[model samples]
Target: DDSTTKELIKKLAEINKCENEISAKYCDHMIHEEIPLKTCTKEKTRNLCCAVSDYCMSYFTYDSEEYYDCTKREFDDPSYTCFR
Candidate 1:
């Protein structure tokens, strides 16, 4: 399952850039769940931001560019909101 793990890792790479901004503890938890969820799903070309945002909602007080890049930039094509 290297391919699946790699695909999820690519998404993680985007969020990993915020290692300093977001809490390390929440980051680990989010990454753990994000990878598993994404890997098991049939979604293609969608970024893992929604799940990331949901998991770290407590860490983010407001929506900003950093949050966009981490969770919305790559997958904000939907009519619904990222946290919705």
Candidate 2:
């Protein structure tokens, strides 16, 4: 169950592009057992909402969004604008 649970949480984090803050926190809580899965699920549910708020309607009055994985240059592409 350890491996399975980690895998599931890891997959969801990747889907959220864990570079973002919510996904990073979710992955940390889920894999590290900082909280129960139920709480993590609710966190994941809200993660999407937070993600849109970051991606769609910020970067002006607010500070720039920080990405954790920007140094992983393996994802190099023009579409992967984080490298820029």
Candidate 3:
């Protein structure tokens, strides 16, 4: 569960510089696939951008380096997220 979440967050972080961008793409991709949020399994496969925002709001205010640090930690957090 948490592992899945972390893995997804890591992927999202890799794909986009910011969580907002990740969220927008994720939503678009999910809509294109016609996959509902409830059926999503992968963290990267779900609305992970929102999850990132929830866990690390500072993402929006931090510099790229700072954001990266927070993102790395979030990606490594076994309790809420993980890296793939």
Candidate 4:
């Protein structure tokens, strides 16, 4: 079960073209998006979008339950924007 979880995270990282830390960072960043704009940074926005796009692709590739969770998180993130 542990290996399965590890493999899932590995596959998600690969599909998203990110290191495990980066993927996790993106996931964490999504949570921070709930804060108001005055506190959000440009770097955060850039990283968030990049991470969200990668997560989207990862979702399509892995079909992991986390895919849906990440997608929903990304969708709800205030910093998320197609134009950005």
Candidate 3 residue lDDT tens string, 22-41:
54564455345633333335
- Using Cα atoms with residue i matched to residue i, what is each candidate's TM-score against the true structure? 0.23, 0.23, 0.36, 0.32
Which candidate leads in lDDT? 3
Candidate 3 residues lying further than 4 Å off, grouped into runs, are 1-19, 22-40, 43-45, 53-63, 81-84
How would you order the candidates by lDDT, starting with the best? 3, 4, 1, 2
Residue 33, candidate 4: how far off, in angstroms? 15
Question: What is the C-alpha lDDT profile of model 4 across 1-84, one tens digit per residue?
Answer: 535533453454345533346445655564457423444465454444445546465546533667656565555644334212
lDDT of 2 at 32: 48
Model 1 residue runs over 4 Å out of place are 1-50, 56-61, 73-84
TM-score of 1: 0.23
* CA shift of 73, model 2, Å: 34
Across residues 1-84, which tens digit of lDDT does each residue of candidate 2 receive?
A: 535433443454346544567445543543344222333354453443234323332322222333322211112322322212
Q: Per-residue alpha-carbon lDDT of model 1 for 10-76, expressed as tens digits?
A: 5654555344444344435544553234333323212344334543343445356565454443233
Query: How many backbone clashes are present in model 3?
Result: 5
Score candidate 3 by lDDT. 0.49
Superposition TM-score, candidate 3 onto the true structure: 0.36
| Weakest 10 consecutive residues of candidate 3 by summed lDDT | 75-84
